[PDB]
């Protein structure tokens, strides 16, 4: 709705709910959903599989408080692989990897501790297909690949070696074309997403498979009188959306 | 206006790639090539391509040949792509060029080049640069790692090309393979990457 | 007619893959079967592997998949017994989804698509394996992982111990046909390695 | 249908379909359903949880081939405890420990080898609250109560220390009120039976309680002639039909 | 009709009639008739020859049993050429000559006495168009070709070299395409088939021309105790269906 | 899918087969060609046609020559099929070569290649691979033998090329006959065999 | 979509050109304020100049331009008070027409187009820069005068000096986003030099 001017109210205030969980935050910025899109269940057309998916709906889609990090005045970003982290977590983790063929989108709530100043937002977007780029040994001969632990961090994160590249050839400043908002916090507060999906194949095993990868990175330094407390803590919450799955057999963690 | 547009963009066309093979043909004295289908390590056509992931493509490339001197010089040509399935030829006498199945064409260096179109191979709804994950089951060693870009969908198969002779050739040939894009539909275009070159092929 | 229909018509994959056993069909294709553990006991193990594995390479099936660079569709099989007719045996059928290993045991088996088989005056037991794939269509060669490539594995198992009669020998054997399913296709024809001679035949 | 001189035919041979699992014996008897009830959903009336239950029915309902069991020409009979067995086997009992309150019924398939002779019927029933007890010592004084294992045996079976006694104060005989089939094998073969329910608890928990409990114990001895295979092995697969959960919460295996 | 698990009954049970020959067998399966075609007379359009057929229907069309064959547990299956078996038996074979342009198909029964275990099933078949193929040295280089006695061996059979070849370049397994049914025996009794035609010429005088010849080869050894009767005989009756013959002129025995 | 349709399987196109006349031409000083009808005795082709034994056939092959080195030269060739019926040319000179109604084209190599259709010729409603039985009559003596597997309906006649000079060519020649299937119908399909080589030609 | 459209959705000029500030872009993005004097300083001075310039040549804008030959249509710009939050400032933003020279001063730049920022909960302002040329393309491609090819210049002032709370700092940054207007259009899609690399991938 809001032009540059205007700007209305209860924008920033939101609730979001799910299976038995819910999140408010008293500042937001309006949620942003990808590309104009909105979850769905893939298409009879679209499914390959003829395998009935099932879709657990509730204890799938709740809201995970996989982990919280904490900040640095300046920190590398890092990267939450989609689908590691749910399936790290269970049951839905835990149904995954019996469920292996595995499809969803989630609604992701990112939620942090506030100040006023809130100076050095931090942005954070997903992409789609997130690659990593080694330096190579920076002779560019070298040519090394990522580690395991780098590429599928497992949710621990990653932390980028180098934010502007985001160690992919891919400019920073571009990275906003992908739907994103950033937190001053001054600005607003734990953003809220949704995210739409593209996924290239209508249903994926998808334990292999990323759908994407979540990236915080401060665009900004953060600032503060010695005074005010030194600590700013980033929590995520997501909740996964509809998921289906197909392939029954044994799980795997891999 | 016209030329901002899409169309005018994609339509352009550019050298895909090209191979020269000396007559004296250290690299294949034989003179047979077995081409990747990796137009991809080319940067600069192929960031286009990768600029619109979706695309629904008619195709048609041109070929043209000529030595490193670009004289032009009379000999006839047969050429084929098998698949990535078929077996690759080993040699000038190999069994696979005459290929009963596998697409050949045959066309003179006198004769005017040759343009054909190729459909969307693609098992995948499309071929998309990116892949994140593993083709591959399993833990992935540090020795996988390698294993990391590479995206099966959007490989192709090999092109064979070789001059028809028992002997070796008198003269070289470029494969100097021209592509030019019909019009384009495409979906879901994807920034730019210049990069490090991490190596290649790269998945970039 | 079609290619496919030939396929229908008859393809058996290779029981066992053994130089003796293939190059003497007979021997590969008797699975035996005895008085054994009721259970626990694993009758084989298969692999889906396209024909890039031997015995669907052996089959009709196999040949014509190599000649396609890509094969989809699901297969059916078939099992029947031989084995004596006054004994009686249960034995259990499985298949697995691929990313699995294999299944390396009866119980394991049995979590993927299963089948139980009470073997009796019906001779014959039709397994089917379903089309299950992330893409619609898969390469007929495999050789290097590819999730795509790999359809998957199956096994069997003794639901239960083979009994016999006394007058029934203990060992009892079971063959294995193989189909394909309405449902097939195969893209790009292009050459089949399969056939080849050094020299000219003229 | 039949009266003891009727007999039709293919009563005998039958199929028993569930998720992705099937059965068919050509030798049966006509199956017999308890109580003349089959297995329903909870009605809403009858449910206190005020949680929506779970119903995964596809994967939940499906043959499983627990364990198979050896014979002897006479053994003691042992007994399956309904709740561990499906608890035991995955993704099922995998899926109860999270979604831990749990009801359900189920349909069961013994399968085992015939012979002819098939003498030495076994007579397997379930009765629901079977409830051991023990001798006490045989003073009766000891006042000793059965062992964990022996109560809930985890689908070990239990063999029956007397069955005629059953180690309860009910007598074997009486036992044929409780429904079930016998198979002599020479009769019939692989037994079909789909239970319905006695629930005391609309919902349960029901990872502590046992619905009922499988017995097989052989009515009569086993005879062959030497010559004839001395192995008779019994098998036994059973589908749990509508199963529901509650309780999401973390899993226990207790 | 059947699917794998239907069955019906009498299926099983036939009767074949011919020309003043019958023959039952209790046990059977359902008759095959090839490509889904039954015989028939040669059409007006089909037949060049301009000289008018005769049909002895009745004569011609009925069962021989041109020769009965013992059987060994394994042995190697020999084939019955078509034509030169009926043409050796008179009367029918005494008039081919006469009329010698001669064309037919013929329904063939096979019968063998049955044994329980019937193990060792053998396969039979016919192919259109079977071809020998030598060895030729094993070199390969000899570039032998095969027996007058081998390619028409009168209906003694020929024992085939190889099963798996064939003597020929198809593989026995692919075989199957081919219209033929399978006596283990255990599962069934005497075939019957009838064979369709395929005919290169519309007529011909079919002295030199094979329609086709059957095989007889076991796929599996057969097996018994050694108590059980070792002999196991194999029979073959057949009866031409529609014959037509022209080209009256004298009969050669050629 | 359409690739595994009858259609796609047959209408790719092979060689053929293919001869090499050497200018020094031991085999043909004169470098004339009486080519046999047989395309039977090349496996690969041959046996897809095997495949289906019956089809409604228009057929177009299409010529292409070139030295064993695969260069051009310049010669004008001319092309015959007499039928098997015709006496088929001795030498250079040979009468039959001119050819009232035998059909012959004249191309020049540099000539683009050219494309011609025959008719399903067989006096046989098909042509089978498969003979059972002699084409003639009579006691089969074991010489007789190696008649067995001869149709005479799928026999057809000879091809004749020659390049015109009464002197002897300066430059070599290959036949590089390449045929493509129209669009087909088939009937009755038989499996493939591989064989032991019994012996060229064989019914295989 | 179109190139144009992607460029719609972000591009950025680099606030300062420098080469460290280029090659560690988020030094380079913010630009300081202070506290200072209410007017008469200069926030920054700016090119129009089409991504010839360094600042619009790093931007995807830049990129796209200079594949184009010409590019026509006004670009729209936006900047962000990123500073204390307390702290209140007023800037004013200036936008110059060509064939004048840099505004080197507050008051000339706000005789052509300006802008005043009350920055406050508004936490973004945009400027917008019209299309003004003489002809209806421009190249994008300067590095010569030409009336068609210079856009223009735009500068930043403080329009009062900054002012902070005891507790806010007393600098502050600002943001500088950038942005292509509806109507952007260029012509004869060409190369682009921006990249290419010495030897051969391969």
Redesign the interface.
């Known amino acids: 709705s809001p032009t540059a001017e205007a700007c209305g109210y209860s924008d920033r205030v939101a609730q979001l709910t799910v299976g038995n969980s819910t999140i408010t935050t008293q500042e937001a910025a309006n949620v942003i959903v990808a590309y104009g899109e909105w979850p769905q269940y893939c298409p009879d057309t679209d499914a390959?599989?003829?395998?009935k998916p099932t879709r657990p709906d509730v204890s799938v889609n709740r809201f995970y408080t996989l982990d919280t990090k904490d900040w640095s005045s300046s920190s590398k970003g890092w990267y939450w692989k989609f689908p590691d982290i749910l399936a790290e977590t269970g049951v839905f983790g835990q149904n995954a990897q019996f469920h292996?063929?595995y499809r969803s989108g989630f609604c992701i709530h990112v939620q942090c501790n506030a100040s006023k100043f809130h100076q050095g937002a931090l942005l954070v977007a997903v992409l789609p297909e997130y690659v990593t780029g080694t330096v190579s040994g920076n002779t560019g001969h070298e040519n090394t690949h990522p580690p395991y632990a780098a590429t599928q961090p497992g949710a621990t994160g990653f932390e980028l070696t180098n934010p502007y590249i985001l160690d992919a050839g891919i400019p920073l400043s571009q990275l906003l074309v992908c739907p994103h908002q950033w937190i001053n916090l001054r600005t607003n507060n734990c953003a809220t997403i949704v995210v739409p999906y593209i996924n290239s194949?209508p249903?994926?095993?998808a334990?292999?498979h990323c759908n994407f990868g979540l990236v915080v990175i401060p665009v900004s330094p953060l600032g503060f009188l010695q005074g005010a407390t030194p600590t700013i803590p980033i929590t995520i919450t997501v909740a996964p959306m509809n998921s289906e799955f197909?392939?029954?057999?044994?799980a795997?963690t891999q | 206006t016209e030329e901002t547009s899409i169309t005018n963009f994609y339509s352009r066309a550019g050298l895909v790639g090209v191979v020269n093979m000396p007559v004296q043909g250290t690299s294949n004295t034989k003179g047979f090539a077995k081409w990747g289908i990796d137009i991809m390590g080319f940067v600069q056509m192929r960031r286009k391509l990768e600029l619109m992931t979706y695309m629904r493509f008619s195709a048609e490339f041109t070929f043209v040949a000529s030595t490193p001197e670009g004289e032009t010089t009379n000999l006839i040509l047969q050429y084929m792509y098998?698949?990535?399935?078929?077996?690759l030829p080993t040699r000038r006498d190999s069994?696979?060029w005459q290929?009963?199945?596998?697409?050949s064409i045959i066309s003179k260096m006198a004769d005017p080049p040759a343009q054909v179109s190729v459909p969307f191979?693609s098992?995948?709804s499309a071929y998309q640069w990116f892949y994140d994950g593993y083709?591959?089951?399993?833990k992935h060693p540090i020795d996988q790692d390698f294993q990391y870009g590479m995206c099966?969908?959007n490989m192709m198969?090999t092109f064979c090309v070789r001059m028809i002779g028992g002997g070796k050739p008198t003269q070289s040939v470029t494969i100097r393979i021209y592509m030019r894009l019909k019009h384009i539909r495409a979906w879901v275009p994807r920034p730019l990457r210049s990069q490090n070159y991490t190596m290649r092929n790269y998945p970039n | 007619?079609?290619?496919?229909e030939?396929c229908q018509?008859?393809?058996?994959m290779e029981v066992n893959n053994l130089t003796t056993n293939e190059a003497?069909?007979?021997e590969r294709?008797?699975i035996p079967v005895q008085?054994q553990?009721?259970?626990?006991e694993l009758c084989a193990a298969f692999k889906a592997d396209p024909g890039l594995d031997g015995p669907w390479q052996?089959?009709?099936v196999g040949?014509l998949c190599?000649?396609?660079?890509?094969w989809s569709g699901s297969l059916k099989i078939?099992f029947m017994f031989?084995?004596?007719?006054?004994?009686?045996?249960?034995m259990?059928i499985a298949y697995?989804?691929?990313?699995?290993s294999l299944?390396a045991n009866?119980?394991?088996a049995?979590?993927?698509?299963?089948?139980?088989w009470?073997f009796?005056?019906?001779?014959?037991?039709?397994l089917v394996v379903?089309?299950?794939?992330?893409?619609?269509?898969?390469?007929?060669?495999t050789g290097?992982?590819?999730?795509?490539?790999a359809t998957g594995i199956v096994s069997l198992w003794?639901?239960?111990?083979?009994?016999?009669?006394?007058?029934?020998?203990?060992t009892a054997?079971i063959?294995v046909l193989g189909s394909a399913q309405k449902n097939?296709?195969?893209?790009?024809?292009?050459?089949?390695?399969e056939?080849?001679?050094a020299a000219e035949?003229?």
């Open positions: 390959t599989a003829v395998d292996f063929l194949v249903f994926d095993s334990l292999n197909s392939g029954l057999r044994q795997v | 098998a698949p990535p399935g078929a077996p069994y696979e290929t009963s199945t596998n697409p191979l098992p995948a083709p591959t089951f399993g099966p969908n198969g | 007619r079609n290619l496919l030939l018509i008859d393809t058996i003497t069909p007979m294709l008797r008085v553990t009721q259970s626990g052996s089959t009709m040949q190599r000649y396609y660079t890509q078939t031989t084995g004596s007719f006054m004994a009686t045996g249960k259990l697995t989804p691929p990313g699995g299944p009866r119980m394991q049995m979590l993927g698509t299963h089948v139980i009470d009796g005056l019906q001779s014959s037991v039709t379903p089309w299950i794939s992330n893409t619609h269509y898969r390469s007929q060669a290097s992982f590819f999730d795509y490539y003794y639901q239960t111990n083979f009994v016999v009669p006394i007058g029934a020998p203990t054997y063959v097939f296709t195969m893209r790009l024809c292009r050459d089949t390695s056939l080849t001679q035949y003229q």
